[PDB]
Amino acid sequence: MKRKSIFKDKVFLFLNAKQYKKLSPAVLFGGGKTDLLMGELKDASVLDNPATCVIDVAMTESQLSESQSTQPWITSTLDLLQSKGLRTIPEAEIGLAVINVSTEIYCNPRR
């Protein structure tokens, strides 16, 4: 049977209000913790601590063929979170790591 220790001793904040409703139970079956807030970064303790993350949308799906008019984008919030202290990890890499049971560096915001 599949691993049940995907994010066993980790928590995250998701920067998305819709995919969250399935990512939450998926990661809970994965053993980990999830929250939905986009302004909790008001204080950087959510980045400084060793086991919290912030989750970006699958913005990595953006095709160079039409990037001028593609809806997903590298919004300033990603760079602001980098400036605070952490990466905003794409949900797409969570899906890959859930498929392969390999939450090693795919979904690590601090590395």
UniProtKB/Swiss-Prot annotation:
Location of the BRCT domain: 2-111
Which cysteines are cross-linked by disulfides? none
- State the compartments where it is located: Nucleus; Chromosome; Nucleus, PML body; Chromosome, Telomere
Q: Domain of life, per the record?
A: Eukaryota
Q: Which residue ranges does UniProt annotate as crossing the membrane?
A: none
Protein role = Component of the MRN complex, which plays a central role in double-strand break (DSB) repair, DNA recombination, maintenance of telomere integrity and meiosis. The MRN complex is involved in the repair of DNA double-strand breaks (DSBs) via homologous recombination (HR), an error-free mechanism which primarily occurs during S and G2 phases. The complex (1) mediates the end resection of damaged DNA, which generates proper single-stranded DNA, a key initial steps in HR, and is (2) required for the recruitment of other repair factors and efficient activation of ATM and ATR upon DNA damage.
Binding partners and assembly: Component of the MRN complex composed of two heterodimers rad50 and mre11 associated with a single nbn.
What does its UniProt record remark on the domains? The FHA and BRCT domains specifically recognize and bind phosphorylated proteins.
**Which protein family is named in the record?**
Belongs to the Nibrin family.
Name of the protein in question: Nibrin
Portion of the parent chain present:
215 to 324 of 763
